[PDB]
């Protein structure tokens, strides 16, 4: 019924437990990744929703919900030598998809 349906995406902590997910709110990490929903399908099961890592957020306390786009991204003004490392990073990434 909302004009902008949405879903948040967080990452689970160690020892996943559905009962704790409904009992306590600390199992979910303070990090959350809010994103807009695309479309439901439910071909076989009644719940096959799609999720995305779109807007990162770190709620200060999910138990308390307030949120802010604290997408920290500090970068040095000279963006010439910082990308030299990127060639090795992509070369590593290329080696993972290549060898594996």
């Amino acid at each position: 019924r909302l004009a902008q349906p949405y879903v948040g995406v967080f990452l689970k902590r160690d020892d996943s437990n559905e009962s704790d997910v409904v009992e306590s709110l600390d199992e979910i990490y303070h990090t959350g990744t809010f994103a807009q929903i695309h479309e439901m399908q439910d071909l076989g099961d009644k719940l096959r929703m799609i999720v995305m890592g779109h807007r990162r957020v770190h709620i200060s306390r999910q138990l308390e919900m307030v949120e802010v786009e604290n997408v920290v991204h500090e970068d040095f003004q000279v963006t010439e030598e910082v990308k030299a490392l990127t060639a090795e990073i992509v070369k590593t990434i290329r080696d993972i998809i290549a060898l594996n």
């Binding site: 030598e81 030299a84 490392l85 090795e88």
Partner: protein
């Protein structure tokens, strides 16, 4: 132009050295994680193959 190209080769090569050296130090600082943790990983992979 050949000297300017040499000075650019100096700056670019010294830059590749600082990037390779910072990356080498940074690889050693990953290598500071103990080998016990690696063998423990293999123990975990031995258990990972327990399905």
């Amino acid at each position: 132009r050949l000297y300017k190209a040499l000075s650019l080769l100096k700056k670019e090569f010294e830059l590749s050295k600082l990037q390779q050296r910072l990356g080498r130090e940074v690889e050693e600082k990953i290598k500071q994680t103990h080998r016990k943790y690696l063998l423990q990983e293999q123990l975990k992979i031995i258990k990972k193959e327990l399905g």
